[PDB]
Amino acid sequence: EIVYKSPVVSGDTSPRHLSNVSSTGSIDMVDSPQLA
């Protein structure tokens, strides 16, 4: 038994929010829960 690279992962992995935003001249809110 020889394994050279084994990143074994068992279970749950959750990356829920992924945003790539480029905004050169801007007013911007990223993932913002603004209320009232």
Partner RNA sequence: AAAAAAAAA
State the minimum distance, in angstroms, from the CB of residue 2 to RNA. Answer: 33
CB atoms within 10 A of CB 6: 5
Q: Which two tokens stand for residue 4?
A: 């050279």
State the minimum distance, in angstroms, from the CB of residue 14 to RNA. Answer: 7
For residue 28, what are the contacts with CB-CB under 8 A and spacing of at least 6?
Answer: 21
Q: Which two tokens stand for residue 27?
A: 């007013």
By CB under 7 A, tell whether 16 contacts RNA: yes
State the minimum distance, in angstroms, from the CB of residue 33 to RNA. Answer: 3
Tell me which residues touch RNA (CB under 7 A).
Answer: 14, 16-17, 31, 33
